[PDB]
Amino acid sequence: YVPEDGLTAQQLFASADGLTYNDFLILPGFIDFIADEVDLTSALTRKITLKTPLISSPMDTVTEADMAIAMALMGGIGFIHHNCTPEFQANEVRKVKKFEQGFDYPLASKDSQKQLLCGAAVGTREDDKYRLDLLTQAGVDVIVLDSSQGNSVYQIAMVHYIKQKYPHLQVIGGNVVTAAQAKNLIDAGVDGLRVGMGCGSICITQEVMACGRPQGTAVYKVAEYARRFGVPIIADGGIQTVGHVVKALALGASTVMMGSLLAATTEAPGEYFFSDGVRLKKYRGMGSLDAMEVKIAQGVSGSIQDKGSIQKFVPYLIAGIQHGCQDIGARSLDVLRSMMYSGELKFEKRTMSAQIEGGVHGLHSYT
Amino acid sequence: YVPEDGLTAQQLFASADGLTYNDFLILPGFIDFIADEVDLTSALTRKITLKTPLISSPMDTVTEADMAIAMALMGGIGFIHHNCTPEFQANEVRKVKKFEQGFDYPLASKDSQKQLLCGAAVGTREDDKYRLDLLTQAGVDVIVLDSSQGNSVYQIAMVHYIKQKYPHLQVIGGNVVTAAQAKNLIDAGVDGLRVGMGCGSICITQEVMACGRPQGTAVYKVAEYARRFGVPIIADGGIQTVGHVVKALALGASTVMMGSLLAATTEAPGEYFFSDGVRLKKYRGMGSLDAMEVKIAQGVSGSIQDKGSIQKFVPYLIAGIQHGCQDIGARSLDVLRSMMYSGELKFEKRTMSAQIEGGVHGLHSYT
Amino acid sequence: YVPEDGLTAQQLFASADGLTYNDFLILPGFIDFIADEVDLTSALTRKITLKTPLISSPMDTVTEADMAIAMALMGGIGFIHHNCTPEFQANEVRKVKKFEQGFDYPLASKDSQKQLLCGAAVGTREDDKYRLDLLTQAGVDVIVLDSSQGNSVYQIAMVHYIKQKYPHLQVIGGNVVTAAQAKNLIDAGVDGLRVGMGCGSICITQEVMACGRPQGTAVYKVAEYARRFGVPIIADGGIQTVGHVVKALALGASTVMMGSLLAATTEAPGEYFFSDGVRLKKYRGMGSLDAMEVKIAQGVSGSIQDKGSIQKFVPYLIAGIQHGCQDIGARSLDVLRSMMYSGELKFEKRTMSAQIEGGVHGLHSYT
Amino acid sequence: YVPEDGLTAQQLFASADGLTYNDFLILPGFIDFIADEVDLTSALTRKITLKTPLISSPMDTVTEADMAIAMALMGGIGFIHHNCTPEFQANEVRKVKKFEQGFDYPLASKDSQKQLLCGAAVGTREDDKYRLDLLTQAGVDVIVLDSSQGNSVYQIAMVHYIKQKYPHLQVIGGNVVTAAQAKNLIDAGVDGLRVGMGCGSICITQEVMACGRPQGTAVYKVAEYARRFGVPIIADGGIQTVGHVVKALALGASTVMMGSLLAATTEAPGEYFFSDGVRLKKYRGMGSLDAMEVKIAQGVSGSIQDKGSIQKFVPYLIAGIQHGCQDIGARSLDVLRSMMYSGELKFEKRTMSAQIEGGVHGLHSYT
Ligand SMILES: NC(=O)c1ccc[n+]([C@@H]2O[C@H](COP(=O)([O-])OP(=O)(O)OC[C@H]3O[C@@H](n4cnc5c(N)ncnc54)[C@H](O)[C@@H]3O)[C@@H](O)[C@H]2O)c1
Ligand SMILES: NC(=O)c1ccc[n+]([C@@H]2O[C@H](COP(=O)([O-])OP(=O)(O)OC[C@H]3O[C@@H](n4cnc5c(N)ncnc54)[C@H](O)[C@@H]3O)[C@@H](O)[C@H]2O)c1
Ligand SMILES: NC(=O)c1ccc[n+]([C@@H]2O[C@H](COP(=O)([O-])OP(=O)(O)OC[C@H]3O[C@@H](n4cnc5c(N)ncnc54)[C@H](O)[C@@H]3O)[C@@H](O)[C@H]2O)c1
Ligand SMILES: NC(=O)c1ccc[n+]([C@@H]2O[C@H](COP(=O)([O-])OP(=O)(O)OC[C@H]3O[C@@H](n4cnc5c(N)ncnc54)[C@H](O)[C@@H]3O)[C@@H](O)[C@H]2O)c1
Ligand SMILES: O=c1[nH]cnc2c1ncn2[C@@H]1O[C@H](COP(=O)(O)O)[C@@H](O)[C@H]1O
Ligand SMILES: O=c1[nH]cnc2c1ncn2[C@@H]1O[C@H](COP(=O)(O)O)[C@@H](O)[C@H]1O
Ligand SMILES: O=c1[nH]cnc2c1ncn2[C@@H]1O[C@H](COP(=O)(O)O)[C@@H](O)[C@H]1O
Ligand SMILES: O=c1[nH]cnc2c1ncn2[C@@H]1O[C@H](COP(=O)(O)O)[C@@H](O)[C@H]1O
């Protein structure tokens, strides 16, 4: 007999401290398989499944056609940003949809016609209807309603309109952090939910508006509620490391969306420049004054260091996730989440001293 | 009559905050002996006892033959690293085993033939069997199975193989942080356990894989479980100070293993170099890309400032431990641990403000 | 009717978090007197009362005869350090005892013969008996047994010896942080207690030996126990501000001892020097290698910025204490402590965010 | 070393469950004296001390002159009831004051003239002033203001009047169960307090008026507050056993007042009668309709079984108290209370199952 060690997820979130990724760890389990055996199949919506849980964010410094093609080939997907004209966006979607490899990718995301999957973002205003018919003529597969606070009559009306006019189109609902928000969007009829508010690397929404939630708590609560109706959720924002990806998936998320991790890659839109002897690319929030152009800024504009190509960077992330799952003792992401919900998966909190101990420390210097 | 002050260890760990060394202190007791009377005899395995609780880590920038000889003479032991050919490792072990002082050390670690004790690390792959054969012909005394997560079918199979083929060899099992992990390795038949995951100074395992545990909690829990079967545990990683050594021993550990504290000594492998006007030596994790050579890095590579010789540095550590035990009121490490388990030893938590108050503060400058 | 706000001291310390001065505040009360009316009379020992609660520390960079004379004139007292020959120490005490003002100070500390009060420190070894003989012929008024851990057979034996040979001499017992330590020294027969271990500005005892206690908790617990026997306690170490003085007095201390606050004044021993364009004086712990001269260092050696004269600095401290007492609504320190013990005085905890809010913030620059 | 067992009184009352005598026990201590050595000296008021803690209640079926003489001879005291004419009451007091033994009692309660001590009860109306002067002419020693709720302007005015006109007379203030009630009466100037409301054996005040407090909690809280001003308190009502007496004294009471325990003794007023083959005496509350004669009844009227003489019954109670103190390890009642306040005395709660286990159980029959 062995006494139990650590906390279940339900106990971990019972004290209501406002935890996020860096505040806890996952305890190791039992290893009886190799890391290359770990299955990463994940549900994007009610009806779309991917071989990898990685999604590119619809930001104008992250995802255009080249990014989307690379993500689809690597086994994820990309959502084209809509900070542009509808004709431009539809042309980007068409470029993705008509790509042909030579004119090996065993994990590529494909539709029935064997074309690459693609997604796009739209707003909740009247002209977005015209945007929408253009995008559907270009052959989009899935739509995300792009908003900081999706629990509104505007977004609900847009969801109803889409469901009426295109009964085949998959729709992902706007950003939520509570079950009460999730309920209205699920009743309106969304096939997926985007979770997170204020946690993004370029975000200042929390400081400016006082509204948001710690991302780990938000992911756990919303996923726990949404699984009751078979609705998968995307964990969006605040991902800085492979460990963060693993933690988000273990807390209930089906997929993970990244802006800053994938910025400054070759496929990202924009030009490379130099400063202080380092190669850089621009990365900015959609709510920064540069992107929008009295108007209130909800994001900043900055730069990221070059990371190389997506087709090199993504396999590193996949291998990291598989090794994390092996250390946990889970041979697939479905098994990981079922162990979490049954209480078999165990967690531990970290003090600030523990977090310092977890990083590099006590060295004169290092690279 | 006096009311009780402070917390017992069991109460200290009851709230499950995820404590490590810097998060608490030990309250003083009653002094009726001098510091030079404090006995530091400690059990390395079921059948090997040392006169000092200090062990050198099997890393390729820490322990080769010179380090191992120095540690054995000072009253500890060293484990030769296996990031090298089996012939090279066996030659290192032979060099340690055939050393003769002149061809005083009252605390030296010796075997029956009166030769210095030595240890070595091996992996869990097929060629490690041949490594084992060579090391056993060189006369090793104890083996550590070297792994980040020892609770696996591979390590269990290797333990069974070693027990079958060399019934006399002492084996220390791979790194664990939970009682459930400890149970499988103890059932397989290990004579000792290495405890710690993610806490090392050169480690990034926690950030990359999301898996680990705060080291103080891990030491307390695993030692409390393992004492039931008479299995001693080594506290491995995260030791930066003599106070950390004392805390680890008071929490239940029998010995303490150090990588970075003993790096940049004369006996450490490698060459001294200069930079920015300071003499330095390389110190790197075994999971860094330099050591291993898609592959995922689990450690970094850095440098440490010169510390002088082991035969000067270790007596400083011994005297520090003895003075800590005197302030606690414990005349031996066995007495210290029995006071801990009986509840006589008392602890107190530290806020961050308390930790700041505990260090140097309020000075213009100091050296 | 008004509901109660805040915590009593007993509730504040019930959760056992390990609080220091910076972790809490005192809530304001009702003002019906001016700040100049606040009485600061305080008990140094069972039989010595001072008009001010301020004491100079027996360190070789803080208190010699000039410091002691200034402190006595301002209404406190100084303890001569014993890092010197007994003849030198006795000469210092004689210089203090024979001082005559002109060869106004309404608060000066005097004895029956109308000479200034003086104190001295001694150790617990055999030659300290001869030191004691010389100091008593020089006319000392009070002795502090100087040790990091006073709960020992050595200190108890020295207390018994002093009580037997000089039944008139007042003795203050070595540094303690628990009631169990306090009990033995009180049974041996001390007239006062020095409280604090590891909290001093130049101290590294906690990091090196793992032994100590947060100073606010230590003061509250030891004073609560010691008042039962009519033994006053000195709060020693970790005082950086007037607010810290006020907090220590409100938690139960009768007097406060300062090393670093009074260092780099004109009366402090040593010479002024310049570096980087600032005038400085040396300030070092008695356990640093410079002071002691294998030996283990328990303190560091540094420098402090010039503060001017004691006869200017101390009145600033007195006025600060009086204004704090006025804001609290206490017209004397005895009344302050009685309000604390009755539960009328109320406290509140501070998060780290609250502590940041409490300091200077949100400025481009300031002086 | 031994861990602490049980709860201190402060911890016992921290959960606010509303405990009374039967809800807890006292844990045994260490015996190093015989039961006959136990000192039972107790303070009745600021200025009257008795050799025994037992008081007779001022009820018209309990205390008249014969009861008062017997109690004084046995070492307690009796308060004459005032449900009668002032001339009758004064005659009773005169009878007590002029008694002479023969016209051995080593514990008898005496005044300076060597006459037996006596007490009397008065109300808070205008004619009570005339009652009071008559009683003072008869030579009363102490007065209790007799009321169910003493925290009123009427009782405060009567206390002021008594203090003005008879500065030598000791006054005990009306029944209270809270510190807020106690404060007003202490400010008015009482020398003692009567504690208890609704707990008496013949009382229905709680059922009729919804106002009261469990007696054990009331005794602890009021005594803890009143000791700060040197005011002793009487525990009044709800005493059925010697164990209850011991518990009340251990919780802080200085004396204990009994109505029903002393009813149906030879000295009690009234006539013996028979019914159903048992000898009985009447015992009724002062608030029952029979005693008062729309009027609301606050007590009932009943009967008690004959107990014999006071001079036999009281020594049994004294011996029981002494044996309880011996089992506790307290050689006097002052020592018992000091052990309680220091935390050395330890208590334990009882479930209902534990209370059943504590009585007689599992027998066919018994006598
Ligand atoms: N996830 C986050 O925390 C976060 C925070 C800030 C910004 N962002 C991103 O930046 C961009 C800005 O988002 P946003 O919320 O400011 O844009 P939005 O268009 O959703 O909201 C702007 C404002 O217009 C209002 N509005 C929207 N549709 C309306 C309609 N049909 N009729 C009337 N009023 C209407 C909204 O209620 C809101 O006050 C998006 O790409 C968003 O995803 C995200
Ligand atoms: N203590 C720590 O937290 C920590 C963390 C990282 C690395 N390290 C150290 O760095 C080095 C690297 O350790 P590691 O765990 O990466 O090495 P490892 O060889 O134990 O593990 C590497 C991978 O190979 C697999 N593997 C091992 N033996 C196998 C077998 N027989 N058949 C199939 N698969 C097998 C493992 O399951 C794992 O996925 C070691 O020296 C280790 O001690 C320590
Ligand atoms: N308050 C603090 O936290 C703190 C910490 C470190 C140093 N200090 C100060 O620095 C100085 C050094 O203090 P310390 O405790 O190192 O000095 P100490 O002389 O009290 O202790 C030194 C060592 O000698 C031992 N010792 C003392 N008297 C002895 C005797 N008669 N026989 C045998 N052994 C004996 C002690 O037990 C201890 O191991 C003092 O001035 C002290 O106040 C204070
Ligand atoms: N201890 C108990 O729980 C308890 C309960 C009920 C009765 N008793 C006893 O029974 C008897 C009845 O007590 P009681 O409280 O009913 O009697 P009381 O005379 O104290 O009170 C009767 C009523 O008269 C009022 N009153 C008293 N003095 C007054 C004044 N000067 N002017 C105006 N109003 C005035 C009171 O406020 C109350 O409403 C007493 O002997 C008492 O000790 C005790
Ligand atoms: O301007 C902005 N203000 C606040 N949040 C934004 C903004 N732009 C994008 N976001 C969110 O931040 C996410 C990316 O955050 P990151 O991965 O942490 O860089 C996006 O997917 C959006 O949900
Ligand atoms: O590359 C690595 N990644 C993570 N942990 C390592 C690595 N190499 C060694 N370790 C562990 O870290 C310990 C030393 O840590 P340190 O004493 O804190 O420097 C070793 O004994 C190993 O257990
Ligand atoms: O060398 C040392 N090591 C640790 N504590 C010391 C040392 N020297 C003095 N102290 C303590 O520190 C106090 C002064 O601390 P400060 O006021 O915070 O500067 C003294 O009164 C001593 O109790
Ligand atoms: O009529 C009444 N109603 C309520 N309480 C009474 C009454 N008469 C006396 N008491 C109280 O009950 C106490 C006696 O209670 P007993 O010892 O439990 O019988 C007296 O000392 C009074 O405080």
Side-chain angles (χ1 to χ4, degrees), chain A residues 25 350 353-363, chain B residues 19-21 59 148 175-177 194-207 211-219 234-240 244 248 256-260 283 298:
Chain A
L25 293 169
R350 305 211 271 166
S353 271
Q355 297 174 227
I356 288 159
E357 188 195 55
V360 180
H361 59 87
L363 294 180
Chain B
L19 310 171
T20 197
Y21 297 133
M59 313 173 57
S148 187
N175 271 81
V176 298
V177 283
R194 204 173 154 191
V195 172
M197 170 177 205
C199 52
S201 66
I202 43 56
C203 177
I204 50 163
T205 287
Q206 284 178 12
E207 277 68 50
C211 200
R213 188 169 209 181
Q215 177 63 336
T217 303
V219 166
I234 302 155
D236 173 24
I239 296 288
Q240 303 171 123
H244 289 170
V256 171
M257 176 192 282
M258 276 151 318
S260 77
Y283 174 67
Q298 272 179 96

Side-chain angles (χ1 to χ4, degrees), chain B residues 5 29 327 350-351 358 361, chain C residues 23 151 206-207 209 213 240:
Chain B
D5 233 333
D327 274 348
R350 305 211 271 166
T351 64
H361 59 87
Chain C
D23 284 308
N151 189 31
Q206 284 178 12
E207 277 71 49
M209 317 252 279
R213 188 168 209 180
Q240 303 171 123

Side-chain angles (χ1 to χ4, degrees), chain A residues 1-3 5-7 22 24-34 37 241-244 246-247 312 315-317 319-321 323-329 348-367, chain B residues 16-23 149 151-154 156 177-181 183-184 197-204 206-215 217 221 225 228 238 240 278 280 283 294 296 298 300-305 352 355:
Chain A
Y1 167 86
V2 196
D5 233 333
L7 308 169
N22 273 337
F24 68 88
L25 293 169
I26 298 160
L27 295 168
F30 177 61
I31 300 175
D32 57 14
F33 54 86
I34 61 159
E37 286 176 63
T241 60
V242 175
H244 289 170
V246 174
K247 281 171 187 171
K312 250 74 137 184
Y316 156 73
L317 298 175
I321 295 156
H323 273 275
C325 286
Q326 199 212 29
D327 274 348
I328 286 161
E348 179 141 300
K349 294 186 189 184
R350 305 211 271 166
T351 64
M352 155 60 33
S353 271
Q355 297 174 227
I356 288 159
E357 188 195 55
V360 180
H361 59 87
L363 294 180
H364 174 92
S365 67
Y366 71 95
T367 54
Chain B
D17 290 314
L19 310 171
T20 197
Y21 297 133
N22 273 337
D23 284 308
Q149 217 284 42
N151 189 31
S152 73
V153 299
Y154 313 120
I156 289 156
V177 283
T178 76
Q181 293 174 286
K183 167 176 165 53
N184 283 345
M197 170 177 205
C199 52
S201 66
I202 43 56
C203 177
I204 50 163
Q206 284 178 12
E207 277 68 50
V208 169
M209 317 259 270
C211 200
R213 188 169 209 181
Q215 177 63 336
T217 303
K221 298 290 186 176
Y225 177 77
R228 291 153 55 151
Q240 303 171 123
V278 58
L280 302 151
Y283 174 67
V294 69
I296 307 283
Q298 272 179 96
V300 298
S301 185
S303 96
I304 305 279
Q305 195 183 306
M352 155 60 33
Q355 297 174 227

